[model samples]
Target chain A: GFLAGKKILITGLLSNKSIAYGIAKAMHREGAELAFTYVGQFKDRVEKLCAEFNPAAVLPCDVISDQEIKDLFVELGKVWDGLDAIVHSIAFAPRDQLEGNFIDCVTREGFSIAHDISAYSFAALAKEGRSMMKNRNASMVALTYIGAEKAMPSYNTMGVAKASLEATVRYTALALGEDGIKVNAVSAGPIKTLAASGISNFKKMLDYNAMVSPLKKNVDIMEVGNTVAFLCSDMATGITGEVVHVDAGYHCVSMGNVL
Target chain B: GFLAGKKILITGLLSNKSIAYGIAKAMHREGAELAFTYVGQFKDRVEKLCAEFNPAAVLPCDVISDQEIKDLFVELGKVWDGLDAIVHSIAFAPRDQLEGNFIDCVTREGFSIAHDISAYSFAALAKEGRSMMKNRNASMVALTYIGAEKAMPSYNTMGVAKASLEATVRYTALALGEDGIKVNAVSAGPIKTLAASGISNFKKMLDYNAMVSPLKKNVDIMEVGNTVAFLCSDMATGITGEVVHVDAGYHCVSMGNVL
Candidate 1:
């Protein structure tokens, strides 16, 4: 009921198990119309899956291209008069950079690529997306993680990327709030999604979290999706520039809350 | 609605404008039966202010004294058969330590006192309060601020103390979770309370946060109080060991999102 008749555009949908996919599913169920974006080769499969919801359209856009993002607004404008929400869930880091000592060894290219696409892309999209936001109450949501605040063994370089992404939420929130636009992020707990499976020993991290987090259970895309829906809806009107945690209370505990 | 008939013990109430006072007022409205605790010198005023709720009793206890803490709970037990929740809004640091650089001038004595009164006390309360919780569904909440995670210019010594306090939430949450008890902290936005006055340039800090926070406003003790009541109630059954922000989306942004 919260998202009734709203328009939502989602990205980072490589598979149904991705966190963005869950958000799209939840938004669709809440009576919101949907649109999606993907890279060139993945467009077909993404559209095939999104066909179930009869998405507005699936367009191809690279995370770092300014021209493509500008064109995306044009295509979206043709289909709908305005947009109500945008979900930026794209993230990437070179495999080598992710496994090495992040502070000491990260290469410039890997670092720049991660920050530009994963973090800056949100701001880039917002620049173009804002004009199509006919309903001034529109909100933008992104994904981040607790690793941005604390250092973990393997969640190294992306940690900095996420920290940058979170900063964008704050800057964008203030910049947009004056115009009745809101920006926020969700710092979700570990889930076994496709993007996370790329991380080394991620299953171990999930197991450890489930074993020690206060709720004693790993979090799910469903829990995270529900929160995204809430933030996108009128229920969270006073809420903006927040990275609400849907992590089963894992971030509050120190050192596993044991030993 | 969440705290119906729940018995709660609260400490750190110094006056009618205190954050703890607001929590008491809210919990009372939600049908929670309450008792108050104050320091010896402030006992009269705190009792007078808290009397509006027809509190079960008013007791005095010193933060650093183990005997006073132990004795206070003993009095709490005699008045109520069991305890269901606690609100620890206590924090203190010497004037010199709070005004200057946290890294340059914090003395060992001041740091120790801040941690003991503001952070360690939560664990101490959990120890004695757990056995008296016959319902096994008890929850404990403490007041914290964004300074715990960031080094605000003059928020010095207390920042480290609150960081320690948040860690205690995690450990205590686990230590008590098996018995159905929970531990949490509310990372409230800046409110101009008596305790906040001790910090240097607090008013400027307040004004700046109001201007830059996403909601473009400052939050009040009443907002923090409502969140406290929620954490102490059944509606948050699956949440624990969390430093949930009741700020107007301030913590999610870095340096107030000015850009």
Candidate 2:
């Protein structure tokens, strides 16, 4: 009911347990009109699952494909004409980048993939969405992790990209806030997801986050999407340039209770 | 009772309702010997409240006074050889900076005063106290607000200073993480105190905060103090360089539920 008439675009929903999946469902429940982007690999699979909501369009996009991002908007204009929110949840780093040491192991090509998809696609999306977002308040949210600042266990290169992702939120918010568009990111706690399966000792990291956090609990994907939906709603008009954590109370302390 | 046997130096305590007051009471309950710093005129006023804790000393040290800061630590090293935690809660802005438009209205002097006292002092305190902090698990905490990142109406020049405070937390956290020292700041929600009293339309801000925060309540000084105590203890060993929000989830929402 809160997001009534809000039009949202989401990316990186590879599986059911994803942050984007939770956000899509919540936005839909709150009365948002949703559309999705898929790579050629998962088109049929994601299209079948997203069929229930009757999305505006499941446009094909490879975030790396410079022209496809612009073309994806033309496809959406056929179904809906205005935009209220943008949820950019795409992130990628090669298996080599995520599993090993942070020193000199990362290749330049691996680094660029992580930077382009995880960080810069957000800016590209914001630039593309600005035309449709002209009428009133618009909110944009990206998903990020704590590894961007505090060193996480083996999240190395992707963590650096997430850092860049957060920096982009600030600069974008500053630029867009002048036009009444708010941009923020949700720094979510660890959750079990297909994308999450790529990290080293992720289960151990998950267990440690819960044990160390003040609340002694873990947050799920839908909870993060609930925040994404709120940001998309008219209620979050004042917020921009933030990375709000939906990771229980884990982000509040250092290593207080883990020992 | 989380911070047993800590020698904590607290700066910028103006009244019984202030954040430092709650922390002093909480830290005392947790077996800490509290010390305070007061500028020229408020000695009697601050001493009266601090007497109950039998503070190690209520030393005269204006944060802007370089010699006073250096002397303040010299006084503390005489009273106690090893320090476990430091709580920094000092902020100041000239009257001209608070009331008017932020665009071209604030003076360079006003900007530096806010930055030096509010943000830079945290780093100065860390550097000055590092020698005494060498032998134990030391924690340093400061106070910040959401205005640092977002454009909160009437927050003005102080917002820029708070941003610097957060940057300091990250860099300091990274540098000190290796030495078993943790540095963090708490971004509190609107509370009705003397410093907070200056905000324009504060009642609406307070009402809106409680209405939108997921906890559906306002945080009291004690709730903030509880977090301060946690960071000061060994429990927070893993946390460093963080600006943790203790505003009952207010920071997590944009204008989602508020009007």
Candidate 3:
């Protein structure tokens, strides 16, 4: 019960197969009163999914829309005067930006769109959620990837966007420290998600990790969820403005053993 | 003559006191032919400094301007035909951004300016320089600080910008791999640079590095310059998209030894 009696909001739950869903399950079991966000036709799916956790609420939040985000926090303020934690598992890049060589990614519109939706959105959420955060100590966690550090085959502009998102974690952590709010990110290893499936040669990235990772296997979704839960818990009080790797030490390998 | 018969371009050489000057001296002593870029009034000092190395040319290239960068590569192409290496020792955050807390940084203009000059400029240089780069192998090295990973007091937005720059290194490395161009960054320990002087409580950071670093001292310019020279040489062909800590292993420590 590390998160006992805590109120948590998790974004990016498209389906039970979603990474955020795994985190929701873990947070609920850890005694957190959990809520989730969904968009469009996915609302029904998210509703059915939330039924499984019996969450506090399954609110609608399209991170791209500032009004939606602000309203969601307003709704949360009514239910819980202060939120204990927030898990940001959202990221996106246009199909074109990610599938080809990076130099070819010269369109200003694509870059800005990606940066706005995928990176700056975190800061937007932090700004809106800061007031509703608990006074003692609150945790803000986001999901990232090693692509933020290394350029995988098909993870092009999204990699750049994630880099910005990770930096926001450090900047926001320092900003919110006065209010006792902690901000951090988890750089999770490769996994098969709807978002990941869009990138070409993504399966190769999975196989590469399976071969090179110290554990010799791809990371389980539950592992990332548990790490997220831990970061949002009291156990990680001293830790803020850091990107902890939940990649089974894959990032630590200099050159794969096969190479 | 460590870099004998090699041709290299070094940026941000404002004075003999600059870190880029030390790197130029090292590369020249190694017999590498040199070229330098200076923006605006720094041009005279850079010209005077170049007299010491007797480089082939001291070009006025403003990295912030795309046309100037393109012209730089054109000039290098005309003068040397092929470049063996390039050292990007450039970083700047506006005085306002450097002095404030991360969130209180009201300068959205400052954030974009810092990213453009400090982070995106490296990618711009790498992209343009690729044309004049050696067909077989060439190296691009940039300087970063440990602040990219750790939240040091008052480093503020520059730390976030460095994280973006580090990610740019990875993307540029992967993009230029086909041309056999290697890109990397050096995360040096604290040093008293004109840029670093803007940071409030700078002495505390230097003192902490000296106290906690395994070597019991902060890294000298020569130490960082020599490592940059090494990475530029053929000796480090296998290393790319890497952040080599020449910080006396300070980054590895968690708490002070007393803990």
Ranking under TM-score, best-scoring first?
1, 2, 3
Candidate 3 chain B: worst-modelled 10 consecutive residues by lDDT: B233-242
The 10-residue segment of model 1 chain B with minimum total lDDT is B250-259
Best by DockQ: 1
Question: How does model 3 fare in lDDT?
Answer: 0.78
Tens-digit lDDT string for candidate 1 (A170-219): 88887777666778898888888877776778888888887777767777
lDDT of 3 by residue, B124-220 (tens): 9988888778475688999998889877656778888998998888777766755767777877777777766666788888898766543355666
Decreasing DockQ order of the candidates: 1, 2, 3
* Candidate 1 residue-wise lDDT at B96: 79
Q: Name the top TM-score candidate.
A: 1
lDDT of 3 by residue, A1-29 (tens): 65899999999988666889778887887
Error of 3 at A30 (Å): 0.7
iRMSD in angstroms, per model = 3.3, 10.9, 13.1
Which DockQ values do the candidates obtain, in the order shown?
0.23, 0.04, 0.02
Query: Candidate 2 residues B1-259, lDDT tens each?
Result: 4466788988877898898987888788878888998988999999998898889989998877778879988989899988888898888887678756797568899998989988888888888888888748788899999889887667888888899888887666655644567778888787787787766777877888767664455777776776677668654554456666766556655555335
Name the 10 consecutive residues with the lowest summed lDDT in model 1 chain A: A230-239
Please give the C-alpha DockQ score of model 2: 0.04
Candidate 2 local distance difference test against the native: 0.78
Over B8-74, each residue of candidate 1 has an lDDT whose tens digit, in order, gives 9988888767888778877998889999888888877887898898899889888688888889889
Classify candidate 3 by CAPRI docking class.
incorrect
